[PDB]
Swiss-Prot record, chain A:
Disulfide bonds join 19-35. This is Salt-mediated killer toxin 1 alpha chain. It comes from Millerozyma farinosa. It comes from the Eukaryota.
Length: 63, 77
């Protein structure tokens, strides 16, 4: 399984709130990057029901 | 900071009854966060794949607005 991605819009805006449980997997040092990874992970897990049974939607996660 | 939420706007490409292991989901997640977003606000277009099969399309949005950006999913098949 893999995620093929491209940045549609890239910025240098670092104004992102901190979070609880910043990810430490895949060599992440927690922090803001870990907050983003934990957010992506939750969204991917949520979408499993939609590839299993079809459908779309908008899913969110605190970052 | 200003951004407090990340959003995923998705649509199904193909039905796939399989499920990626935690190890795979973590690798997907870390790659995008570290090499795509790079700790900054932005928009990513993506496709979840199961081997060579294109399964799901997701537009990932990280912006100042905490509100649902809506719009359409975008992909990277």
């Amino acid at each position: 399984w893999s995620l093929r991605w491209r940045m549609q819009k890239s910025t240098t805006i670092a104004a992102i709130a901190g979070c609880s449980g910043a990810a430490t997997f895949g060599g992440l040092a927690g922090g803001i990057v870990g907050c983003i990874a934990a957010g992506i992970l939750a969204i991917l897990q949520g979408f499993e029901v939609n590839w299993h049974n079809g459908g779309g939607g908008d899913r969110s996660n605190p970052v | 900071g200003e951004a407090t939420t990340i959003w995923g706007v998705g649509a199904d490409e193909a039905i796939d009854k399989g499920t990626p292991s935690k190890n795979d989901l973590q690798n997907m997640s870390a790659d995008l966060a570290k090499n795509g977003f790079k700790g900054h606000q932005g928009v990513a277009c993506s496709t979840v794949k199961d081997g060579n099969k294109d399964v799901y399309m997701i537009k990932f949005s990280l912006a100042g607005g905490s509100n649902d950006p809506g719009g359409s999913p975008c992909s990277d098949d």
